Amino acid sequence: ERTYLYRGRILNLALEGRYEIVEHKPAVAVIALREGRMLFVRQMRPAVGLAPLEIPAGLIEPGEDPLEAARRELAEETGLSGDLTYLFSYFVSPGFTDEKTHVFLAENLKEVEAAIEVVWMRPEEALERHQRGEVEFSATGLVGVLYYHAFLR
Amino acid sequence: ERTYLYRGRILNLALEGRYEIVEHKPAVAVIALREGRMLFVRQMRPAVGLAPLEIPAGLIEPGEDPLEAARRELAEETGLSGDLTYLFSYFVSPGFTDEKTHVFLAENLKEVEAAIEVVWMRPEEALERHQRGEVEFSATGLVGVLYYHAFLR
Ligand SMILES: Nc1ncnc2c1ncn2[C@@H]1O[C@H](COP(=O)(O)OP(=O)(O)OC[C@H]2O[C@H](O)[C@H](O)[C@@H]2O)[C@@H](O)[C@H]1O
C-alpha cells in the first residue's frame, strides 16, 4: 500500500514500505528517419539544466492511447504526420518510477502544420557528437540512435 | 532556484518555478555478452509491481566514479568481474528527473564470487519475448538489446 507525500501535475510522490515511488503518466516517443537524418528535438529541461538530444516525445493524456499521443506530439512538436508503427516499450527507471515509454517508428512523413528546437541529424553524427562530449542524450534519443544502427541502415 | 518538498534515501522532490523535479543519484549499467547470451537481471520492482528485464545496474555511491560503481554492481549482482569499457550515457527522463545512467561494456568475464535473478538470454529472444508481451523492459535492458543488435553481432 502507498501513502502519498505529494500529488502533482505530472507526478505523485508515494512511500510504499521502505520504497520511495514516483508515479508518472506514461510517455511516447517517435523514431523518424528522412534522407539519412533522424528527427531529434531539443528543449531546455530544468531538471537537468541543459537541452539533451531527444526524439519527439510526450505524455499520454486522458482519453488517449499511445498511438494517438504519438501522432499528437509528432504534430505539435515538429508539424509532421506519418504512418506510425509500434516498436516496443520500456520503463524509464523502474527502481523508483512507474513511467513507461511506448516507442513508435514514423514513415512517410508529411508537413501538416508550419520552445522545441527541431534537429534533423544523421544518427552517426549524433553518436559521434555524444562520444566527444558535445551533446547529452535522453533515453529516447539514445534508443532512437541505437535502433537506427540496429535495424534502419 | 529549488525548494525542497522531500529529501529522501534515493531521491529528493523539489519545485523549481512551475516544474516538479526529482533529484536522483546517477546510475550505471553493464552490457555483457557470453556465448551469444546477454547478461540480464530481474528483481521485483515495487514502483511497477513486476520484474522487468534489466541489465546489471546500480547507483553510484559516495566516493565512486562510474567505472568503479559498474564493477561493484556487476560483482554484487552476478558475481562476475570483467574488463569494462565506457560506451555512452543518457538521462533516463529529463522532463522530470536528473538521473543520468552511464553504460559500460564488459568483456572477459570471470566469476569472482559464488533478490536478484541472473538471466542469461540471447538478445534476439529477449526482443521476441517482449514483442509477444511476455516480458517488460527497463531502459537499461532495451539499451542492451539494441546495442547488441547494432554493434555486437
Ligand atoms: N525506490 C526506492 N526507495 C528507497 N530505496 C531504494 C529504492 N529502490 C532501491 N532502494 C535502495 O537503494 C540501494 C542502492 O541501489 P542499487 O541497488 O545500487 O540500484 P538499483 O538496482 O535499485 O537501481 C539502478 C538503476 O536501475 C533502475 O533503472 C533504477 O531506477 C536505477 O536507475 C538499494 O540497495 C536499495 O536498498
Ligand SMILES: Nc1ncnc2c1ncn2[C@@H]1O[C@H](COP(=O)(O)OP(=O)(O)OC[C@H]2O[C@H](O)[C@H](O)[C@@H]2O)[C@@H](O)[C@H]1O
Ligand atoms: N517537470 C515538470 N513539472 C511540471 N510540469 C511539467 C514538467 N515538465 C513538463 N511539464 C508539463 O507537462 C506537459 C505535458 O508534457 P509533454 O510535453 O507531453 O511531455 P515532455 O516532452 O515534457 O515529456 C515526454 C517525455 O520526455 C522526457 O523523457 C520526459 O521526462 C518524458 O518522459 C507540458 O506541456 C508541460 O507543461
